[PDB]
Amino acid sequence: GSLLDGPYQPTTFNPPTSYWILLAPTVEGVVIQGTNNIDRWLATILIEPNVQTTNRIYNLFGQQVTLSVENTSQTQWKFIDVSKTTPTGNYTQHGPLFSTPKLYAVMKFSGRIYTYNGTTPNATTGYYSTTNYDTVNMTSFCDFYIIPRNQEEKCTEYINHGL
Ligand SMILES: CC(=O)N[C@H]1[C@H]([C@H](O)[C@H](O)CO)O[C@@](O[C@H]2[C@@H](O)[C@@H](CO)O[C@@H](O[C@H]3[C@H](O)[C@@H](O)[C@@H](O)O[C@@H]3CO)[C@@H]2O)(C(=O)O)C[C@@H]1O
Numbered sequence: 001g002s003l004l005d006g007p008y009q010p011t012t013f014n015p016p017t018s019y020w021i022l023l024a025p026t027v028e029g030v031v032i033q034g035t036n037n038i039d040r041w042l043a044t045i046l047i048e049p050n051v052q053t054t055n056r057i058y059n060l061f062g063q064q065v066t067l068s069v070e071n072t073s074q075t076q077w078k079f080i081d082v083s084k085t086t087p088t089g090n091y092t093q094h095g096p097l098f099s100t101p102k103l104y105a106v107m108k109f110s111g112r113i114y115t116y117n118g119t120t121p122n123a124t125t126g127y128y129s130t131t132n133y134d135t136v137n138m139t140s141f142c143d144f145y146i147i148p149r150n151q152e153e154k155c156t157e158y159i160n161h162g163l
């Protein structure tokens with residue numbers, strides 16, 4: 001499609017501002033992680049359908065982090081953003097997205113990192129205020145695509161309905 005650059009292999013990079021990074025993960029685990037190395041460590045984890053509240057170990061920024069996770073949905077996969085604001089602090093969970101297409105997206109824009117939240121096919125966006133935001137480097141652990149912001153409508157369409 002003319003609004004979808006890629007696909008690209010899993011990589012560490014500094015994503016350009018005002019571009020949505022569309023992620024196409026497969027199995028459960030860590031989808032993407034990013035930090036400004038100041039006061040924001042952010043990652044997105046993926047949980048398969050039908051998971052009762054349980055402790056799972058995730059490799060976040062090179063260390064084993066145990067988080068209590070659940071997915072009450074029997075049909076939809078669950079993306080959860082996890083965030084800490086100090087290097088030694090605990091990760092808290094935010095902006096879940098319940099997803100049928102199993103696509104996620106992240107964007108650096110206007111002092112923030114934006115992601116999707118809610119339930120497909122009616123997903124919306126949410127954001128995380130991030131100091132010195134365009135220094136944020138990210139590691140995607142799955143294949144991804146690039147879509148500009150001026151067609152966020154298109155990214156939202158992909159999130160809600162798939163490729
Ligand atoms: C997707 C999402 O939740 N986005 C919000 C984020 C994240 O929750 C946060 O970045 C994860 O670390 O938070 C935003 O700002 C909120 C954050 O700074 C929290 C920290 O405690 O405070 C919120 O305001 C509080 C306020 O301090 C209280 O007095 C009371 O009124 O409640 C409000 C709401 O909890 C900040 O709004 C962010 O921009 O990073 C807001 C995002 O919507």
Ligand code: NA
Nearest residue numbers: 095115116117
């Ligand atoms: Na989210």
